[PDB]
Every structure is written in structure tokens, then in C-alpha cells.
Design a protein around this ligand. Sequence first.
Ligand SMILES: [Cl-]
Ligand SMILES: [Cl-]
Length: 162
Amino acid sequence: MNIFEMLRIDEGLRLKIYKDTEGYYTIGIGHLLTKSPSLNAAKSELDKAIGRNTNGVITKDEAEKLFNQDVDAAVRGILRNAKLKPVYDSLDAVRRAAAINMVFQMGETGVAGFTNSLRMLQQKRWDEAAVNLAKSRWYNQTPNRAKRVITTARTGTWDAYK
Ligand SMILES: [Cl-]
Ligand SMILES: [Cl-]
């Protein structure tokens, strides 16, 4: 298991513009296109992202390209973030995959927020970070995926994904 296969499971793959859980226009593997209510602002964002006139439809390859750029951007957002980096640097490789999952889904600003959990993760207080992470909108909105990420953080194993 790795961060790519982990996220591919959690986000699925979709070759046509679609709406995410929050109602936002998305495509491929969890690639947010826009928060605007326009299928047209979205077809616009999509085209600019792909470099061609897609008509709201992309291939596996294009989707994978987006995916790769987004995992890359999550990692880099973590490493640049003064709040995130040290927590991240302190973790093992499995747990790191979890942090990355969180960032890809909710953005660096969101996670950077989770102050208390961050502190407990760093202190390697596993059970408690898991309890605190659950007290969030995130968990309440997408509980099964959140449970998977949270077990990954708690345990340091890929159990939840096998
Ligand atoms: Cl992009
Ligand atoms: Cl879910």
C-alpha cells in the first residue's frame, strides 16, 4: 500500500465532471475544479488544468496526471507549512501517508487548523489524537473515509485499507 493507492481508494476515479460530497465540481481522482455553482466555470477550470478543450471529459491518463500533481502539491504544502512540517517530520511512513491524505482532502489551511490533534500526534499520543480527530465536521461529513484515515494515524498500519 502507498499514498497513491490509498487515495485512489478513498476518492475513486471519475472521467467526467462530477460533484463531490460538498457539492463542488470535481473530476478524475478527487481533483477539485471549483466551488462555483457553474458547470461552466468548471468546464473552464478543467480546460485550463488539462491544456485542451475537453468538454468536461478527460482520459485515465489526464486524470492520473492531475492526481500526480496533486499528491506532489500536498507533500510540498506540508513541507512549507510551519505548523505542519514538524508534526510530519516526527511521524513514521504509514502515519505520514495519513497526514498527506488529510491535506489532499481538506487543504493545508484546514488541517493546519486541527491544532490540538497536531500536538497529540507529535507527542505520539495515538489513542487520544484519534479521539480528538473524530470531533470534527470532517468526520461527521465523511465518516467512513475519516475512520480509515484516523485508524491509519492511530495504528501506523494499513489495516483499514486491506
Ligand atoms: Cl491544476
Ligand atoms: Cl465517507
